Write a protein that binds this ligand. Structure first.
Ligand SMILES: CN1CCN(c2ccc(Nc3cc(-c4cccc(N5CCc6cc(C(C)(C)C#N)cc(F)c6C5=O)c4CO)cn(C)c3=O)nc2)CC1
Length: 263
């Protein structure tokens, strides 16, 4: 519970699922992003109840929640500030002319954060390059982890919705609503593909529907040119048709370390 007096609003960063997000200073010194929650976009009381849990989630590679402001409307969510913004856009900028090592570097960051959530048995539910951020050092961090539970948009929270993360979702999710640490693993594999394909949309030639048939038939995403055999094998391991046969984030992290050492 941060006092709003300790906040100054400086510039606009954009708009997300809960509305406008601003850059500004906390306590006149610390860079912050401040979500201004559009009224009616969130289960606000539930989020407030469960926000205490999300504040204990502290990791070098998770976008840190600093505090909330809930004695006013709209409510605020104060978070760590990421200077280079959204990973997806960052990947799509060709001037960066990334080396494959820098790409694997970005995978190791996300995996490190997910490893920690997995230990805390805390599901993201929407892991994708659009939901990851890049700070002034090129470090990638996982953002908005766990906030899917409080969305009040039926285009997002329904399987048939226009905003549902279909292309990041394993078959068991899409057909049965079977959510587990394994559906975060699946999404993580898709995110590794994103990174090595340099921001291409997964199944770029298919609709969401064609994508769901495709993966129910045991068919998967092709190797991005910039992925070696070893890197491709890692993401594909995330996509086993049996959920319980997919690796942990612990195993994936050690997998990534190996290629780093090898290639
Ligand atoms: C010209 N300018 C130059 C500068 N550019 C720039 C530079 C820096 C930044 N830095 C930052 C941008 C954002 C930011 C801004 C707008 C929207 C969102 N999103 C996207 C993901 C998301 C998912 C979900 C769900 C629920 C879907 C999940 N999971 C719910 C949500 F609320 C949101 C959300 O709010 C974010 C990220 O939270 C947050 N933080 C902390 C930054 O540091 N952003 C932009 C912008 C363009």
């Amino acid at each position: 519970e941060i006092d709003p007096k300790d906040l100054t609003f400086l510039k606009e960063l954009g708009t997300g699922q809960f509305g406008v997000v601003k850059y500004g200073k906390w306590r006149g010194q610390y860079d912050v992003a401040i979500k201004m929650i559009k009224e009616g976009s969130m289960s606000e009381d539930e989020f407030i109840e469960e926000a205490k849990v999300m504040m204990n989630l502290s990791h070098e590679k998770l976008v840190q929640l600093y505090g909330v402001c809930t004695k006013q409307r709209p409510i605020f969510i104060i978070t760590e500030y990421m200077a280079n913004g959204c990973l997806l856009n960052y990947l799509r900028e060709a001037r960066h002319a990334f080396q494959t090592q820098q790409l694997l570097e970005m995978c190791k960051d996300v995996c490190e954060a997910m490893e920690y959530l997995e230990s805390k048995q805390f599901l993201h539910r929407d892991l994708a390059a659009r939901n990851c951020l890049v700070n002034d050092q090129g470090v990638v961090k996982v953002s908005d982890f766990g906030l899917s539970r409080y969305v009040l948009d039926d285009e997002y929270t329904s399987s048939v919705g226009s905003k549902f993360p279909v292309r990041w979702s394993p078959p068991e999710v899409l057909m049965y609503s079977k959510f587990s640490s394994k559906s975060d693993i699946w999404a993580f594999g898709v995110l590794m593909w994103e990174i090595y394909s340099l921001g291409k949309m997964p199944y770029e030639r298919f609709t969401n529907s064609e994508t769901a048939e495709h993966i129910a038939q045991g068919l998967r995403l092709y190797r991005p040119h910039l992925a070696s055999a070893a890197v491709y094998t890692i993401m594909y391991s995330c996509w086993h048709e049996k959920a319980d046969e997919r690796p942990t984030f612990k195993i994936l992290l050690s997998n990534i370390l190996d290629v780093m050492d090898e290639e």
